[PDB]
Amino acid sequence: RSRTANRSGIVIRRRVTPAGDIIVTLLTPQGKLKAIARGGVKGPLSSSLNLFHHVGVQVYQGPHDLASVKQAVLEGALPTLAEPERYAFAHLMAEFADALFQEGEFSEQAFDLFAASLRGVAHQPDPEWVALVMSYKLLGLAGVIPQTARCARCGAPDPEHPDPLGGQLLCSKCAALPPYPPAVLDFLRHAVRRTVRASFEQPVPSADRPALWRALEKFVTVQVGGVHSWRQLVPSGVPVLS
Amino acid sequence: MRSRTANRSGIVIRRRVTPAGDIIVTLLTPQGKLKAIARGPLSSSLNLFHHVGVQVYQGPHNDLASVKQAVLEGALPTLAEPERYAFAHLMAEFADALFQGEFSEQAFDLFAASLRGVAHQPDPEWVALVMSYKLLGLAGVIPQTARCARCGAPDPEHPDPLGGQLLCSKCAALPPYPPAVLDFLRHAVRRTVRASFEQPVPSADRPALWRALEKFVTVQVGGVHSWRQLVP
Ligand SMILES: [Zn+2]
Ligand SMILES: [Zn+2]
């Protein structure tokens, strides 16, 4: 066999190093990939290795630890991601996906769903809704265990209330907060199993979305280790003025 | 706070959402540290590291100032990158612990700049080292590096395991610091942040810098440390 390999995926992070190297993380159908393009800023590879580009790369893994990029070819771009609102949601999906899947957990199915999330944010009228739908859908492919059929505390069937401690759901007896409204509940109960096409057709109104983002944040942070810096990108206000 | 209602602007450095849904925050502002609660509608959810404008009410019956309005003034999206987030978190904890009414307009501007640097520069670890020492300068604290910490002899070159300053060759038990480390310890507090940015200490020598800072702050500064847990 050989120490050089062809890989293909989407750039989710780009670091320009003090030496002018470019360190990228990619999501690919064969897993997460970190690699360095040496003297990359000042040569032919700089523009291709940018956020959200689908690139083909030839990488070399030395015998003894970061893979080095020998060639890079742009396979796919979404120019509309330069629109600030779309960029923001693409960026959320990128950091969220990286946070959600630990090393080895990132499958081909996850790659395909991730790529579709970027297409959706790039092309659809309501990119926040794409990101809500896709982020919940990715829970089904990862190491967390979604559980909406029983109260997270006592086990009672069909809980309808927020779970501030674990980010699941509580029954009316275990809960100190009012029930989620019906469209929120319906989303929470079915978002993992429902096709993304089906979910895109049933958007939850904007007023009910903070509840959805909050539940997602609590659940992921309780279930998955890490810093969950991706929460910096969850919708949290519109900037004032320039 | 020297009135009941007030308009304030700063950066959220700590954020907790209570089981009841209340957001409790600490802000650094040009007029000092401000702790506040948003009960439960607001224009901004007061996210960590965001620069926000708030209107707060504080009367004689409230423990914490109560947030009545909040708008986002600006955000640094690249703080979403785990490594940059970690250094921003370090800076936040640092300034919380370091500034006991001590926190001034200039400290605010330096703090904000530390976040921008962490967000935007290729070497966030370096931004954090430089900014931490710089902030010591604007606080009560100040490493005396001009003189041996034990006997007072001028221009000490050796580690100070007990206090994180510097010892002279006659009081010291350890070999002298490398020249680049020494140069930084002597001048980091007064050098402009830009000049320090142009002279990064190599990474092999940085653990000696973190160890001195941490020792000096422990000895000189009140409150234990959440901050210490995040030092590299
Ligand atoms: Zn129950
Ligand atoms: Zn001495």
Q: How far apart are CA A11 and CA A9, in angstroms?
A: 7
For tokens 């066999």, name the residue.
A1
Cβ-in-10-Å burial (0-12, 13-18, 19+) of B214 comes to middle
- B169 shares a domain with B89: no
Choose from B11, B55, B81 for mutation: most chain A CBs within 10 A.
Answer: B81
Q: How far apart are CA A30 and CA A64, in angstroms?
A: 22
Give Cα separations from B72 to A39, B196, B203 (angstroms). 38, 31, 36
Q: Which residues pair with A33 in a beta bridge?
A: A26
Q: What is the CATH number of the domain that holds A154?
A: 6.20.220.20
- A130 shares a domain with A173: no
Q: CB-CB: which of A18, A92, A227 is closest to B122?
A: A18
Q: How far apart are CA A170 and CA A168, in angstroms?
A: 7
- B66 shares a domain with B26: yes
Phi and psi, residue B126, nearest 5°: -60, -45
Take residue B15 and report the two structure tokens written for it.
């954020």
Asked if A122 contacts A80 with a C-beta cutoff of 8 angstroms, the reply is: yes
Q: Tell me whether residue A171 is annotated as binding.
A: yes
Residue in chain B nearest A96 by alpha carbon? B80
Phi and psi, residue A94, nearest 5°: -60, -50
**How is residue B77 annotated by DSSP?**
G
Phi and psi, residue B141, nearest 5°: -55, 165
Phi and psi, residue A46, nearest 5°: -60, -45
Task: State chain A's maximal CA–CA distance in angstroms.
Answer: 63
- B136 shares a domain with B159: no
Q: Which residues pair with A56 in a beta bridge?
A: A8, A73
Select from B56, B80, B104 the last residue of a domain: B80
Q: Which residues pair with B70 in a beta bridge?
A: B54
Using the beta-carbon criterion (under 8 Å), do A88 and B79 form an inter-chain contact?
Answer: no
Q: What stretch of H or E contains B34?
A: strand B32-38
Phi and psi, residue B168, nearest 5°: -80, 170
Q: How far apart are CA B139 and CA B146, in angstroms?
A: 18
Q: How far apart are CA B18 and CA A133, in angstroms?
A: 26
Select from A54, A82, A110 the last residue of a domain: A82
Contacts of residue A105, defined as CB under 8 A and 6 or more positions apart, other chains included, come to A142, A143
Query: Strand, coil or helix: what is B12?
Result: strand
Asked if B114 contacts B35 with a C-beta cutoff of 8 angstroms, the reply is: no
Of the candidates B203, B211, B115, B123, the one whose C-alpha atom is nearest the C-alpha of residue B159 is B211
Q: CB-CB: which of B52, B80, B123 is closest to A95?
A: B80
Q: Which domain holds residue A195?
A: 83-144+180-242
Give Cα separations from B29 to A107, A162, B12, B53, B139 (angstroms). 45, 34, 9, 10, 15
Number of C-alpha atoms within 13 angstroms, CB side, residue A237? 25
Q: How far apart are CA A213 and CA A217, in angstroms?
A: 6
Number of C-alpha atoms within 13 angstroms, CB side, residue B32? 8
Q: What stretch of H or E contains B56?
A: strand B51-57
Take residue A2 and report the two structure tokens written for it.
């050989």
Q: How far apart are CA A96 and CA A135, in angstroms?
A: 8
For tokens 């809980």, name the residue.
A159
- A207 shares a domain with A136: yes
Q: Which residues pair with A169 in a beta bridge?
A: A162
Q: What stretch of H or E contains B216?
A: helix B206-220
Residue A119: alpha-carbon gap to chain centroid: 13
Show which residues on chain B lie within 8 Å of chain A, measured between beta carbons.
17, 19-21, 43-50, 52-53, 70-75, 77, 79-82, 84-86, 89, 122-123, 200
Phi and psi, residue B78, nearest 5°: -75, -10
DSSP letters of chain A?
Answer: --SEEEEEEEEEEEEE-TTS-EEEEEEETTEEEEEEETT-TTSTTTTTS-TT-EEEEEEE------EEEEEEEEEE--GGGGSHHHHHHHHHHHHHHHHHSPTT---HHHHHHHHHHHHHHHHSS-HHHHHHHHHHHHHTTSSS----SB-TTT--BS--EE-TTTSSEE-TTT-SSPPPPHHHHHHHHHTTTS-HHHHHTSPPPGGGHHHHHHHHHHHHHHHS-S--GGGGGS--B-----
- B107 shares a domain with B47: no
Contacts of residue A229, defined as CB under 8 A and 6 or more positions apart, other chains included, come to A95, A99, B79, B80, B81, B82, B84, B85, B86
Task: State chain B's maximal CA–CA distance in angstroms.
Answer: 64
Q: Is the dihedral of CA B146, B152, B153, B157 positive or negative?
A: negative
Q: How far apart are CA B106 and CA B6, in angstroms?
A: 21
Region of residue B49 (phi > 0: left; psi between -120 and 50: alpha; otherwise: beta): left
Taking residue A141's Cβ as centre, other Cβ atoms within 10 Å add up to: 21
Q: How far apart are CA B149 and CA B160, in angstroms?
A: 8
Take residue A102 and report the two structure tokens written for it.
């630990």
- B88 shares a domain with B197: yes
Q: How far apart are CA B81 and CA B52, in angstroms?
A: 21
Taking residue A193's Cβ as centre, other Cβ atoms within 10 Å add up to: 10
Elucidation method: X-ray
- B121 shares a domain with B85: yes
Using the beta-carbon criterion (under 8 Å), do A232 and B75 form an inter-chain contact?
Answer: yes
Asked if B67 contacts B38 with a C-beta cutoff of 8 angstroms, the reply is: yes
Q: CB-CB: which of A18, A92, A232 is closest to B79?
A: A232
- B168 shares a domain with B65: no
Q: What is the CATH number of the domain that holds A197?
A: 1.20.1440.120
**What is the count of structural domains for chain A?**
3
Take residue A98 and report the two structure tokens written for it.
């990286």
Residue in chain B nearest A163 by alpha carbon? B19
Q: Which amino acid is at A128?
A: E
Asked if A203 contacts A191 with a C-beta cutoff of 8 angstroms, the reply is: no
Using the beta-carbon criterion (under 8 Å), do B71 and A240 form an inter-chain contact?
Answer: yes
Classify strands B65-74 and B32-38 as parallel, antiparallel or unpaired. Answer: parallel
Take residue B153 and report the two structure tokens written for it.
């002899």
Resolution in A: 2.0
**How is residue B122 annotated by DSSP?**
S
- A149 shares a domain with A65: no
Phi and psi, residue B175, nearest 5°: -75, 165
| Rg, Å, chain B Cα set | 19
Contacts of residue A84, defined as CB under 8 A and 6 or more positions apart, other chains included, come to none
Asked if A232 contacts B119 with a C-beta cutoff of 8 angstroms, the reply is: no
Asked if A207 contacts A221 with a C-beta cutoff of 8 angstroms, the reply is: no
- A208 shares a domain with A136: yes
Give B132 Cα–ligand 2 centroid separation in angstroms: 26
Residue A143: alpha-carbon gap to chain centroid: 14
- Could you write out the three-class secondary structure of B151-173? CCCECCCEECCCCCCEECCCCCC
Residue in chain B nearest A87 by alpha carbon? B77
What's the gap in Å between the CA of B101 and the closest CA on chain A?
A: 29
Select from A48, A67, A82 the last residue of a domain: A82
Give Cα separations from B219 to A201, B89, B138, B162 (angstroms). 60, 22, 18, 8
Helical packing angle, B124-138 and B82-98, nearest 10°: 10
Asked if A69 contacts A45 with a C-beta cutoff of 8 angstroms, the reply is: yes
Q: How far apart are CA A199 and CA A126, in angstroms?
A: 12
Asked if A127 contacts A89 with a C-beta cutoff of 8 angstroms, the reply is: yes
Q: How far apart are CA A90 and CA A27, in angstroms?
A: 13
Long-range contacts of B178-182 (CB under 8 A, 24+ apart): B178/B205, B178/B208, B180/B205, B181/B205, B181/B208, B181/B209, B182/B157
Q: How far apart are CA B181 and CA B13, in angstroms?
A: 30
Q: How far apart are CA A174 and CA A170, in angstroms?
A: 6
Q: What is the CATH number of the domain that holds B66?
A: 2.40.50.140
- B113 shares a domain with B62: no
